[PDB]
């Protein structure tokens with residue numbers, strides 16, 4: 001059985017790096033991370049000092 | 065990094081109040097709740113005494 | 129077996145009341161109404177005297 | 193010919209009132225507003241003092 | 257309030273059995289499981305000895 | 321001209337059998353049933369004695 | 385309250401004429417037809433003597 | 449950079465002519481119109497003397 | 513077993529004729545073409561001498 | 577690099593068997609088939625002697 | 641109230657840079673740009689000297 | 705007439721490079737490649753030594 005968690009990573013550099021940011025966090029806390037699916041992308045402008053790229057991923061991990 | 069939980073709130077009054085019901089529950093248990101996105105709405109009729117409005121939200125919270 | 133009818137309710141007050149308007153009509157004519165799913169919402173402005181909220185629902189009822 | 197503008201209204205009270213907030217703004221600036229279609233709903237929590245309901249609408253108006 | 261977890265069940269037999277596999281896991285760990293919604297189906301071929309059917313479900317459970 | 325009715329069939333056995341359950345009901349009442357399109361699948365757990373598979377189909381039939 | 389029926393019209397000439405074919409049938413049987421929304425289009429080739437254009441419409445009519 | 453405007457053209461003749469009606473209006477007012485994407489089609493029946501075909505297009509034009 | 517090819521037909525006349533243009537090409541090369549499903553429509557303006565209607569179809573054909 | 581082919585399998589028994597029917601055909605002709613994604617399901621009724629389940633899959637295979 | 645404009649940015653380097661290209665243009669002309677949502681991505685090949693990445697964004701800005 | 709092939713490119717570096725990987729393969733084998741549309745993005749983690757970015761594109765090419 002696989003389970004997915006819905007995470008939004010951030011980066012000041014790129015959409016790829018923002019996806020990596022989410023996956024890194026998943027790997028900090030979860031065992032057996034197997035894949036991530038991009039489900040949304042966007043950019044925060046008017047709340048931050050530098051544009052911040054956001055990539056939302058479903059991160060799948062194997063249970064047991 | 066943000067994480068989302070998928071919650072369905074209920075209310076006997078309105079769709080807005082049903083969204084609030086989910087957000088209230090998230091805030092009981094989670095720190096740093098930042099936003100909610102409505103993803104579905106419906107009404108339970110033939111299981112309850114009074115019509116029950118349901119609003120399903122992805123509730124986003126900041127990790128750390 | 130359940131069947132659904134696709135109804136658009138109207139209200140001069142709210143989206144919730146417009147959903148109720150459709151469900152009320154279903155219950156006038158059908159037995160065993162069990163649930164409604166919101167599928168669209170909108171507002172009529174330039175055909176009516178007062179803004180009219182519209183909520184479109186699939187209304188499910190049990191056959192037999 | 194109709195044209196649509198994509199507006200997000202806000203309210204501290206309800207999703208219906210947030211839709212009205214967008215439509216009111218359209219009517220301030222545009223002639224012949226005829227209808228609005230809800231395309232998204234959400235709630236701002238962690239940037240404001242009170243929860244703020246957001247309703248995004250395509251607001252249609254007749255040209256000429 | 258209901259919460260959903262996003263699980264992918266597997267089976268060497270059928271899509272129905274793969275859905276059951278996810279629901280079984282949810283029921284091992286959660287109280288008050290009430291319903292599951294199928295959101296995706298697929299088949300793993302080139303990583304396994306026998307074709308493996310996958311059915312992804314949102315599994316809803318009642319909180320409290 | 322074809323018309324479609326939106327039916328949800330149920331089965332304690334499988335998603336295929338639940339689709340058949342809806343089609344059987346359509347054929348009880350309608351002439352010239354020609355095809356069915358699956359539009360949703362799910363499982364009822366916390367209202368029934370045994371898990372109940374649901375398959376929702378648009379059932380098309382030829383008019384005249 | 386409005387209700388919609390899901391009809392597929394056919395024509396050997398065009399997608400527009402196929403939509404008209406469905407609307408014509410609705411108007412044969414229903415009072416107060418107000419609008420139609422195109423939801424699908426296709427072409428039957430390998431069952432007919434001439435290509436047959438199909439346009440599927442939700443046809444809305446006012447109740448009462 | 450390209451920008452899109454969301455226009456609904458109308459015609460008493462066809463869906464193609466309704467798309468043209470929107471594009472014609474865009475070209476009246478905008479320079480460097482490059483393409484249009486159909487996003488919706490429908491028919492107005494119960495507000496007009498003759499059925500009126502509507503085709504909604506995103507009309508893209510090049511900035512500068 | 514059926515297979516589909518994803519083709520975009522073009523016409524200077526109409527969306528229907530653009531669909532036909534794709535189907536004609538499929539029939540030049542493939543046996544047992546059975547149906548086509550429209551999946552997108554658009555108009556090329558700023559690359560051609562005359563507006564060019566495009567209709568994208570999945571064209572299904574029977575294998576063997 | 578992976579490529580996908582869009583195939584509809586058929587079966588008189590089940591949706592799972594119809595998916596298998598498509599995958600079997602892919603494996604007859606292609607090397608390195610790795611996975612299949614279900615994209616549609618339906619039932620043919622009014623053209624065949626027995627109901628025929630159809631499952632449409634994108635079948636992915638590795639190039640080289 | 642927020643308003644969105646639908647812009648397609650271009651870059652010879654990356655999808656991230658193409659999003660930035662659109663946002664830069666919005667910021668040239670608009671005050672109070674707050675966020676951008678990616679809605680499409682693609683690559684122009686057969687009209688340009690070098691592959692050109694395109695990222696389409698809804699760019700939101702606060703009115704007043 | 706245009707045709708599209710559905711390809712998934714891979715890269716250890718970025719989503720942009722993964723799109724390029726698919727387009728490069730198309731250009732190895734096909735004449736008159738004109739454009740690519742991104743339809744999915746994801747990351748393989750638990751099958752490879754280094755995270756592998758995947759970008760799925762419909763690659764369009766002109767026939768004849």
Ligand SMILES: [Cl-]
Nearest residue numbers: 006070122262
């Ligand atoms: Cl989710």
Ligand SMILES: [Cl-]
Nearest residue numbers: 134186326390
């Ligand atoms: Cl329907």
Ligand SMILES: [Cl-]
Nearest residue numbers: 198454506646
């Ligand atoms: Cl838009």
Ligand SMILES: [Cl-]
Nearest residue numbers: 518582634710
């Ligand atoms: Cl495809």
Ligand SMILES: [Mg+2]
Nearest residue numbers: 011012013050
């Ligand atoms: Mg930096």
Ligand SMILES: [Mg+2]
Nearest residue numbers: 040041042056
């Ligand atoms: Mg998002």
Ligand SMILES: [Mg+2]
Nearest residue numbers: 075076077114
């Ligand atoms: Mg009360």
Ligand SMILES: [Mg+2]
Nearest residue numbers: 104105106120
């Ligand atoms: Mg729901």
Ligand SMILES: [Mg+2]
Nearest residue numbers: 139140141178
């Ligand atoms: Mg009042």
Ligand SMILES: [Mg+2]
Nearest residue numbers: 168169170184
């Ligand atoms: Mg609607």
Ligand SMILES: [Mg+2]
Nearest residue numbers: 203204205242
């Ligand atoms: Mg207040």
Ligand SMILES: [Mg+2]
Nearest residue numbers: 232233234248
């Ligand atoms: Mg939104």
Ligand SMILES: [Mg+2]
Nearest residue numbers: 267268269306
């Ligand atoms: Mg076995």
Ligand SMILES: [Mg+2]
Nearest residue numbers: 296297298312
């Ligand atoms: Mg999936």
Ligand SMILES: [Mg+2]
Nearest residue numbers: 331332333370
């Ligand atoms: Mg049994």
Ligand SMILES: [Mg+2]
Nearest residue numbers: 360361362376
């Ligand atoms: Mg459903």
